[PDB]
Amino acid sequence: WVNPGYHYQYPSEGGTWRYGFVNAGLRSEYNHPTKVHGSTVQKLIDGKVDKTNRSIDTAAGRYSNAYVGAINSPGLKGRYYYRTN
Numbered sequence: 001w002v003n004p005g006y007h008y009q010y011p012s013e014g015g016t017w018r019y020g021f022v023n024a025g026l027r028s029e030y031n032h033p034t035k036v037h038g039s040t041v042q043k044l045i046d047g048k049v050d051k052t053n054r055s056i057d058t059a060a061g062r063y064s065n066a067y068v069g070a071i072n073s074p075g076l077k078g079r080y081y082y083r084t085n
């Protein structure tokens, strides 16, 4: 199970990174105001990777969108990634 709602980090590279269990999925979303950027999320069940979703290379000023639809079940955990180009 994942304590729901976006969690936030502020990369040294710039921008805002938000991720977590939100609106029926695991999500990783990164906004960089000027650079091409992206994000990735992995869905874990009992520690095993069930799915990986990688955002496309995303335009400056928009949040990248990495998502896996999920039930917030007892075995659910997420792992989250961001990138700049």
Ligand SMILES: [Cl-]
Residues within 6 Å of the ligand: 038, 039, 040, 081, 082, 083
């Ligand atoms: Cl990424």
Ligand SMILES: [Cl-]
Residues within 6 Å of the ligand: 047, 048, 049
């Ligand atoms: Cl695995």
